[PDB]
Amino acid sequence: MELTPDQQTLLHFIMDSYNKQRMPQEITNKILKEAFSAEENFLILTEMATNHVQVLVEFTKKLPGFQTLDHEDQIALLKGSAVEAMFLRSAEIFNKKLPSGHSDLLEARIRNSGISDEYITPMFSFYKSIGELKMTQEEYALLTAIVILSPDRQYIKDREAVEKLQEPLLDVLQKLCKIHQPENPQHFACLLGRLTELRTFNHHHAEMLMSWRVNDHKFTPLLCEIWD
């Protein structure tokens, strides 16, 4: 029927942190103005990818309990969720935030950046599949928090501490499905489908970086350090 005052408080903190994301004006202006070349298109995308890492960290820091975790486990969670959080935020932006005209130029830039179809095809396939679910802002925010507070990421020393933060988010998300979609009992199951679909992007992304060499304009030293 309704969220408990404690669940409402937890949801508000995640919503507030999630709603802080705002695509910078200089990035939006570049999508419109810059030359339509593989080199210029790839540079725009690298800047967007780098900007997402800063957005992710700032969002994560405000997640209830994140700051209470061991410092090395905070790093491990950020590193283990970076790719997954990026594709999820990208799916939200592509289906909601960006206007039809600029989304079209951004899609044109992505499709003409030098990146292989082996990575572009599952990317847009996932955006369409996310779009079908007509996710609310509470659902995107909670799914993002769930993705980041994953207890099974590599190099986590205290997994029980992370499970204690992830379990109440899964409880709130399932409750929100029961309140807002009481006619569709499979709504929560569809959202879980996106968690497993997002996991497939870790491999796709790792291979994409491997395809990049020093001789090519695609070599991104900073991003390659954050992604391993």
């Binding site: 890492v53 800063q54 960290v57 820091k61 905070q74 950020l78 590193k79 350090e225 954050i226």
Partner: peptide, 12 residues
């Protein structure tokens, strides 16, 4: 190692 993530996490 993890110098950028560390800096961003341990700032403001």
């Amino acid at each position: 190692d993890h110098q950028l993530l560390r800096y961003l996490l341990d700032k403001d």
